[PDB]
Amino acid sequence: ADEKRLLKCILHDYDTAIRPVQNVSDVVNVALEVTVVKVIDLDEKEHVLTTNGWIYHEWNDFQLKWNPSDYSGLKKIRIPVDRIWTPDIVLFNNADESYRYVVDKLAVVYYTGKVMWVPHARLRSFCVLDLSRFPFDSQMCTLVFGSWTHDVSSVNVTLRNQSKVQYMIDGKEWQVTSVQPKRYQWTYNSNENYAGIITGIKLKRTSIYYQYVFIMPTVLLAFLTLLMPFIPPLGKERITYGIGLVLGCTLLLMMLSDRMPTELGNVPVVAAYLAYVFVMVAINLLFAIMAINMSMQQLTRVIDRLLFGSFLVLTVVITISMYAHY
Amino acid sequence: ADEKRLLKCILHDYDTAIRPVQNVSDVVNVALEVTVVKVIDLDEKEHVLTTNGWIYHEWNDFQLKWNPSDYSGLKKIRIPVDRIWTPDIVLFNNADESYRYVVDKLAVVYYTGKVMWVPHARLRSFCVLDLSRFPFDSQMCTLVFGSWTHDVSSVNVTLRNQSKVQYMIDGKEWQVTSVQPKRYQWTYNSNENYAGIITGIKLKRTSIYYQYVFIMPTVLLAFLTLLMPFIPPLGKERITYGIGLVLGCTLLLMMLSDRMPTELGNVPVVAAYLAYVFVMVAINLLFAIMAINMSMQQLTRVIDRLLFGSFLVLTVVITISMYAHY
Amino acid sequence: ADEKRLLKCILHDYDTAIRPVQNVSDVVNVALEVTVVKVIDLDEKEHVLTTNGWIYHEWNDFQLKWNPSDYSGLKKIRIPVDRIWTPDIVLFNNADESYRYVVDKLAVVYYTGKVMWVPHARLRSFCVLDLSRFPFDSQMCTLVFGSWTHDVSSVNVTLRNQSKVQYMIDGKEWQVTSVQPKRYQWTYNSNENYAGIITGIKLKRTSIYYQYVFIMPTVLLAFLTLLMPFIPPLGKERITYGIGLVLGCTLLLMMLSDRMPTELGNVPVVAAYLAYVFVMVAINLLFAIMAINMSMQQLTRVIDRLLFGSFLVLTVVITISMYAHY
Amino acid sequence: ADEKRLLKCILHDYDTAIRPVQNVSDVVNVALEVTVVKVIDLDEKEHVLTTNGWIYHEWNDFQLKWNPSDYSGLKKIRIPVDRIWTPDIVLFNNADESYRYVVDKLAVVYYTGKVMWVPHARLRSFCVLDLSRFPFDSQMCTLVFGSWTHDVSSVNVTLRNQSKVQYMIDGKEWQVTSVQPKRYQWTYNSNENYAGIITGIKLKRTSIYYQYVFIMPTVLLAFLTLLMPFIPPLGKERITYGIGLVLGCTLLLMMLSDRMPTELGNVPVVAAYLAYVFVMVAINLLFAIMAINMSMQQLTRVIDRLLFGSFLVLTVVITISMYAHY
Amino acid sequence: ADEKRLLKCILHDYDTAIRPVQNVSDVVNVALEVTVVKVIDLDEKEHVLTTNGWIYHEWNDFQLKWNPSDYSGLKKIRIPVDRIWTPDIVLFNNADESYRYVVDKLAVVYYTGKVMWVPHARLRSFCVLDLSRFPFDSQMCTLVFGSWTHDVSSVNVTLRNQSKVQYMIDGKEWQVTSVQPKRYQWTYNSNENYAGIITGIKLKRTSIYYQYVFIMPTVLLAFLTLLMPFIPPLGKERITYGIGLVLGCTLLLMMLSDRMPTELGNVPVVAAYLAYVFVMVAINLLFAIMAINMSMQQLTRVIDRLLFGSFLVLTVVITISMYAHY
Ligand SMILES: *[C@@H]1O[C@H](CO)[C@@H](O)[C@H](O)[C@H]1NC(C)=O
Ligand SMILES: *[C@@H]1O[C@H](CO)[C@@H](O)[C@H](O)[C@H]1NC(C)=O
Ligand SMILES: *[C@@H]1O[C@H](CO)[C@@H](O)[C@H](O)[C@H]1NC(C)=O
Ligand SMILES: *[C@@H]1O[C@H](CO)[C@@H](O)[C@H](O)[C@H]1NC(C)=O
Ligand SMILES: *[C@@H]1O[C@H](CO)[C@@H](O)[C@H](O)[C@H]1NC(C)=O
């Protein structure tokens, strides 16, 4: 055939380690354009982001060079990567033990050595999450690419000439805002410098799950605690009501802890509000016990009325402070 | 022997990278028919679907050709895939890090190059699930196959001529309705175009587990809350009963949060009903507190009777709104 | 040496793809008998069965043939499978992504071509569980083996001449009853026919863990629920005691749903009894509420006495209905 | 160099399948001594033991034979296992799907063919646990090694001549008692026999975690239940206190069931004590209900005093029955 | 080209097993410098530490040598590890089944044989954690490297000449203090001796999650317990309040046990304080029961006043003893 002849005549002595350059001092302008097609998940327990995407490689090759006119056209040939040279561009903060690939076993070539190896992969990266806004958070994550082994003296990791990648991959759990990728000059040491590509993915949470699971039960428990001071001390249910709120707040705290991650910086607003209704319960149990001991003149009516007013105004201001996020 | 000499004569210089076509401009008509023999699971926590099945490959081969009359019949020979050409048809939204195979190490051949590579695999795909009807939902799943590396200019990914695949794989947990596969012409970019095969599996949930675990306790707590307004204010148990319902609703909310997935769009109907009975408990506890403070003329009888009637009508209408699904 | 000489002389041109037969129309009589030496687990959550065992392969080989008389005896030679032909017999409903092996890297040979390859493996299969009797169930499991690629026209998958495998692998968690293997002729399509070997493992549950965790607390909660009607209505404890039973039943339902699997058909007996004690606490709370509102002539004594009699007889008859299983 | 000359001159025709013996009837005396350097864990949920260690191989080799006198000394050469013959000695109850290795890629050799391959591995084995004494248990586990493929007619799996391996690997979670390895002749069938090596590791639980998490709360709730009969029937708190104990024992039962394994033989002592205190709560709630029923002559004082005495003596005798273990 | 001919001329007969030394008695001075760039996690459940980093390997190579002057410069060439010699330096207490690598498939070489292999890896090691100060702890962990197969007679595992690695890679969950690495001479046996490089990472916990989820609810439950002696015995709520505290403490214990690791030595301070609050509730319920029995002259007022004083001083002193950690 003809493709077999081309493979025989252009993979004669092509070692998979030799740098595909003519002049040793010259480098190869390896391009890159990473695209995320679907974000899988963002687990804050281990600060892992799992996003499905494809990485667009493109580099010139001095050794791969053939003319189509004598070889009957055939301007598109597909070569597996195991037989041609390959850049070592990998994601720096990969979560997986090994950097895995999907259909990264075949790369197209052109007559002017213009390979377009495009692996697809489930990138598992690390990003910092600011849970101060949690769950109404906008934790932007970063995907980073580059070569750990060789540096700018070997390859010039550059961005694609056409960077029309202003896409919005809207999902059912997150809304994704793509950020135009940039190039930064990494410095392994003082003498030598490396190259790197940064891309940004801004995640805005649009799922109702966390609101329904935390905000509604917590605010409604705060609602019952707001009505705590009304029960008369002699009813023998005031302290029982308070301890019931203790149990309910403890259950909500256990659930939130089961959900909210261990590796945390500042406390989330929902966790703070749950803690704050918990101390609400503590303080108004203090006042209920004081009132019942004093009952056995009865001026406790003014006391718990002003107490109710103070808790109304302070709880509503903390609630609006929390709501200002959304 | 005969098979050994046939292998020697037909694998002389068959590289595993060369496209098996005579004319370079011509393509190879690769067929496909995916069949699901047993669905394993559908985990909505990560929107993953695990289904066991086999995928049927069929393509003509120009190079592999022999006459059986001189070679003593032998119309069926079994060749491992590592020695012959192979299409890169893969599932687009694979959940696994790598696209794994089961007994995809041997493919049959015919004298007119008519290979029948039939891998078996545990396909792990992604689905979009409308949790509104959950658990009485019909979350359809799609399995999509195609070639990421090479495109229509290389292969024509086409459906089987005989598509009698109207089967129903009825399981003990899901009712599976097969959908006749379709072919869609994927467009990687404006200049180049690709091919793809999409199949559908409609999943009907027939498991008693979910409604037993959620609907029964939730409607039961709704029943108990419905009876709350009879408890006299002076009995010192109405508030205790209400806080007991608070604790029960909190426990049901914890179970729902543990089971119902985080990656959620609209709220499920069972979650809505649970939140609705939870705010029910809030409101009728408010009325109980107002009644007990007003007790210490006693018109609360008419008040809680009309209250009970209003909650009868609204609880029955929300319950029948839920039941309209089933 | 002599073993190296034999290997050089009898593995001259032995490709690992050629069918080891003299006449092409003739097939090779591959024997098989799977033996389970220790069952690991049976997880009903994903219908997975993990059993450790060994699979006995035995097939004649036309090509491998030498006389020991001129080769100084030596009737026992060990060959790794990577260099000899191997049947593709695999388990049809494997749960693992790939069909893995243990010490399946060496197979013995005889002078009259009687290879006795015996892999050991952790078989991970699928079972259908009739959990109506759960936990006092007898969920039988089936292990099925055969060749997906090649069929009866290639190999005759048969049982061993002697099938004395009537063993009982009694464990500390399961009673294992082996079933003699059977051969069934699988039909991939109308024109072609395949072969398969099925074996059965009857699993009796002898563990006390599930009993102690579910039946004892459930029946004792039902016991307390039975005593609820004796509490006088005016004691302000009947409603509190009833809601305490409601919370206890809710917690027990949480733990049961945590343990009992999602992929379910008919409801298990313990789950039915738990739902039934939920109904119990609901109904007797209804009657207690009616009694307390009616208290404010007091004929409720006859009412709750006949109520206790009716509920005692129905609870004991349902309890003996459950006990009839064990 | 010189080591390259050794490698060229001793790996001339070294096949990795030939048995390293001169006379075919003779066997090779393969020695072994497994050593555990750090036990990772013992999970009773799946009866798995994860222990880090190294396994010591030692066998004579006929083909490796060279004298240092003409070869400039060099008594120490390191050979990777891929080019040298190795025995198939593998753990008989391996828990992993495949038998994994750590730095089992290089083995030393001597001039008198005395290969000393010493792999390191995380052995994941199966052992039987007597949960009766749990947590104050001494569940000894066994590691068993041998050759599944070939038998005593091929290798004589023997123990090290110097077996001074009476070490104590004391950890922060388990007390490890080493047991001298023994050799047994495994019988695959009646005609042929195999070989095997047993080592024993006795695990004494010295952790305080299980005591603090189960014994303390269970005995403490038992302490509260012991004081239940003092509460007067008319105080309207005896029944509420009893149901609070019901909820407490239910919570401890849930957490214990979450921790205690499913694959269980006889009931653990802590589980038995928890069941005992739970039926304690049932019985004394029965007596409280009867006392309040007769409350509405009051001879109940003698009744609950003698009840307190009898249940105190039986509580303390069961407690000392538990304490006899520790 | 030039790199291709250099590779042909310098990988003529370079086996990947021969020690790269001229004199057999001489050793090769393999250097090492480990760097941790980002700690992932420290899971005390299995005493595992996951830290992302890179390992700096550097060794002389006698065979690998060229003169750049006649080879047109080219002072740095990139070579994959599969074709050159490699040290077997690995982490001694690796948690993973196999020692995995990231981009450890390419190593640079210099003209004076100064290979500078720099693998990157997710080190999963074992370290001892002193849970006494937990969560306000400083549990140091150790990473250790060395050669299990060959010893000092083969390689002199030395530390980097420039050890300016005094970096503080502070994260959002742990404050990381690097410790300058040291060299220790491991002794496999009496006759032979090995080498090893040890480095230390001091991990200070700065996360707010742990104290927020444990100490705050625990200290506030102790606070609520402290108010208990005020409730009058005749109010029929003191026993109910106490049993509510018992249930809350039981829930808190269940949550802590879910979080606190099983592999434990000394009890953590938070767990001890929780045990103290159980003792709190038990003792004050005992006194409450005694007071209510004695109520039916009333000198109990002095009793619970002095009880409050004694328990307040004991709780405040244990609280300040706990706070002395932070
Ligand atoms: C790499 O490309 C950038 C793009 O502007 C250029 O500034 C830089 O000089 C290039 N470096 C090399 C070594 O080619
Ligand atoms: C592929 O097959 C479809 C089936 O009708 C046909 O319409 C299309 O033209 C074919 N394309 C090529 C490139 O053969
Ligand atoms: C396979 O063996 C069975 C055993 O009786 C026999 O009935 C059948 O004819 C055999 N088939 C072939 C193709 O040898
Ligand atoms: C193996 O060694 C044991 C050690 O005493 C010996 O009793 C036995 O006879 C040996 N067997 C063979 C086949 O060498
Ligand atoms: C290894 O290096 C250390 C560094 O001082 C030195 O003390 C020791 O003697 C060396 N050993 C060998 C065998 O070179």
- Tell me the three-class secondary structure of E131-199, residue by residue: CCCCCCCCCEEEEEEEECCCCCCCECCCCCCCCCCCCCCCCCCEEEEEEEEEEECCCCCCCCCCCEEEE
Give, in degrees to the nearest 5, the angle at Cα B97 between B96 and B99.
Answer: 65
Q: Alpha carbon of B204 to those of B29, B142, D274, E223: distances in Å?
A: 35, 14, 42, 52
CB of E21 sitting under 6 A from ligand 5 = no
> With an 8 Å Cβ cutoff, are D99 and C102 in contact?
yes
Indicate the SS3 state at residue E224.
helix
CB of B27 sitting under 6 A from ligand 2 = yes
B268 class by beta-carbon count within 10 Å (0-12 exposed, 13-18 middle, 19+ buried): buried
Whether the CB of E143 is below 8 Å from some CB of chain D: the reply is no
Indicate the SS3 state at residue E297.
coil
- Which residue intervals of B73-207 are DSSP H helices? none
Indicate the SS3 state at residue B129.
coil
Residue of E27, E158, E161 to mutate, ligand 5, most atoms within 8 A of C-beta: E158
Question: Which residue has a Cα nearest atom 14 of ligand 3?
Answer: C156
> With an 8 Å Cβ cutoff, are D99 and C101 in contact?
no
Task: Evaluate whether C130 touches C42 at the Cβ level (below 8 Å).
Answer: no
Q: Name which of C16, C61, C90, C97 to mutate to probe chain B: the one with the most chain B Cβ atoms within 10 A of its Cβ.
A: C97
Q: Which amino acid is residue A132, in one-letter code?
A: S
Direct distance between the N- and C-terminal alpha carbons of chain B, in angstroms, rounded to an integer: 66
| A contacts of E110 (beta carbons < 8 Å) | none
For E307, phi and psi rounded to 5 degrees?
-60, -45
Dist. CA C203–CA C184, nearest whole Å: 23
Indicate the SS3 state at residue C304.
helix
Task: Evaluate whether A249 touches A223 at the Cβ level (below 8 Å).
Answer: no
Quote the ligand 4 centre to E189 CA distance (angstroms).
28
Dist. CA C171–CA C175, nearest whole Å: 6
> With an 8 Å Cβ cutoff, are E246 and D241 in contact?
no
CATH superfamily ID and name for A3-205:
Neurotransmitter-gated ion-channel ligand-binding domain (2.70.170.10)
What number does the ligand 5 atom closest to the CA of E195 have?
A: 1
> With an 8 Å Cβ cutoff, are E240 and D235 in contact?
no
For C184, phi and psi rounded to 5 degrees?
-125, 145
CATH T-level fold of B3-206: Acetylcholine Binding Protein; Chain: A, (2.70.170)
Method: cryo-EM
Task: Give residue A87's Cα distance to chain centre.
Answer: 26
Dist. CA A124–CA E25, nearest whole Å: 47
| E contacts of A259 (beta carbons < 8 Å) | none
Q: Alpha carbon of D172 to those of B103, D53, D325, E130, E261: distances in Å?
A: 46, 17, 21, 10, 12
Whether the CB of D19 is below 8 Å from some CB of chain C: the reply is yes
Dist. CA A90–CA A64, nearest whole Å: 24
Q: Which residue in chain B has the smallest CA separation from A255?
A: B254
Quote the ligand 4 centre to D27 CA distance (angstroms).
10
Q: Where are the beta strands (DSSP E) in B185-320?
A: 196-205
Q: Which residue in chain E has the smallest CA separation from D206?
A: E265
Q: Which amino acid is residue B222, in one-letter code?
A: A
Edge-to-edge strand order for the sheet containing D174-184?
D89-91, D140-147, D196-205, D174-184
Whether the CB of C264 is below 8 Å from some CB of chain D: the reply is no
Dist. CA A242–CA B243, nearest whole Å: 9
Per DSSP bridges, beta strands B158-159 and C31-43 are unpaired
Query: Which chains have at least 3 CB atom pairs separated by less than 8 Å from chain E?
Result: A, D
Whether the CB of E273 is below 8 Å from some CB of chain A: the reply is no
Window 286-325 of D: residues touching E by CB (8 A cutoff) are: none
> With an 8 Å Cβ cutoff, are E262 and D173 in contact?
yes
CATH superfamily ID and name for D209-323:
Neurotransmitter-gated ion-channel transmembrane domain (1.20.58.390)
Dist. CA C56–CA C35, nearest whole Å: 8
User: DSSP class of residue C212?
Assistant: I
Question: Which residue has a Cα nearest atom 10 of ligand 5?
Answer: E156
- Cβ neighbors of E196 (< 8 A, separation 6 or more) are E92, E144, E145, E146, E157, E183, E184, E185, E186
Dist. CA D201–CA E33, nearest whole Å: 37
> With an 8 Å Cβ cutoff, are C98 and B100 in contact?
yes
Task: State both tokens at C32.
Answer: 């098989």
Q: Which ligand lies nearest to the CA atom of residue C152 in the structure? A: 3
> With an 8 Å Cβ cutoff, are D172 and E128 in contact?
yes
CB of E156 sitting under 6 A from ligand 5 = yes
Task: Evaluate whether C79 touches C63 at the Cβ level (below 8 Å).
Answer: no
> With an 8 Å Cβ cutoff, are E38 and A93 in contact?
yes
**How is chain E split into domains, by residue range?**
3-206, 209-323
What number does the ligand 1 atom closest to the CA of A195 have?
A: 1
CA torsion sign for E265, E271, E275, E276 is positive
Whether the CB of E40 is below 8 Å from some CB of chain A: the reply is yes
Indicate the SS3 state at residue A320.
helix
Residue of D19, D59, D156 to mutate, ligand 4, most atoms within 8 A of C-beta: D156
Query: A238-259 and E208-226 helices cross at what angle (nearest 10)?
Result: 170
Task: State both tokens at B161.
Answer: 């001529």
- Cβ neighbors of E180 (< 8 A, separation 6 or more) are E163, E165, E166, E199
- Cβ neighbors of B84 (< 8 A, separation 6 or more) are B11, B14, B16, B61, B64, B107, B109, B115
Q: List ligand 3's pocket residues with C-beta within 6 A.
A: C 27, 152, 156, 158
Quote the ligand 2 centre to B28 CA distance (angstroms).
11
> With an 8 Å Cβ cutoff, are D3 and E19 in contact?
yes
CB of D175 sitting under 6 A from ligand 4 = no
CA torsion sign for C192, C193, C194, C200 is positive
Residue A261 preceded by cis peptide, ω within 30: no
Question: Which residue has a Cα nearest atom 1 of ligand 3?
Answer: C156
Q: Which residues pair with B91 in a beta bridge?
A: B145
Q: Name which of D224, D281, D308 to mutate to probe chain E: the one with the most chain E Cβ atoms within 10 A of its Cβ.
A: D224
Task: State both tokens at C204.
Answer: 């009796």
* Residues A71-106 as b or e (16 or more Cβ within 10 Å = b): beebebbbbebeebbbbbbbbbbbbbbebbbbbbeb
Q: Which of D73, D100, D120 sits opposite E148 (nearest CB)?
A: D120
Q: How far is C186 from chain B (nearest CA, A)?
A: 14
- Which residue intervals of chain C are DSSP H helices? 3-10, 209-210, 216-227, 238-259, 269-295, 300-323
Q: Name which of A35, A66, A78 to mutate to probe chain B: the one with the most chain B Cβ atoms within 10 A of its Cβ.
A: A78
> With an 8 Å Cβ cutoff, are A279 and E220 in contact?
yes
Dist. CA C20–CA C84, nearest whole Å: 10
> With an 8 Å Cβ cutoff, are E250 and D245 in contact?
no
Per DSSP bridges, beta strands D158-159 and D31-43 are parallel
Indicate the SS3 state at residue A289.
helix
Dist. CA E105–CA C129, nearest whole Å: 48
CB of D152 sitting under 6 A from ligand 4 = yes
Q: Which of A76, A220, A235 sits opposite B292 (nearest CB)?
A: A235
Indicate the SS3 state at residue D32.
strand
Dist. CA E318–CA E226, nearest whole Å: 13
Window 200-219 of B: residues touching A by CB (8 A cutoff) are: none
Query: Which chains have at least 3 CB atom pairs separated by less than 8 Å from chain D?
Result: C, E
Q: Which of D76, D223, D248 sits opposite E247 (nearest CB)?
A: D248
Dist. CA E276–CA E263, nearest whole Å: 22
Q: Which ligand lies nearest to the CA atom of residue B152 in the structure? A: 2
Q: What is the DSSP string of A99-157?
A: ---BS-S-EEE-TT-EE----EEEEEEE----TTSTTS---EEEEEEE-SSS-TTTB--
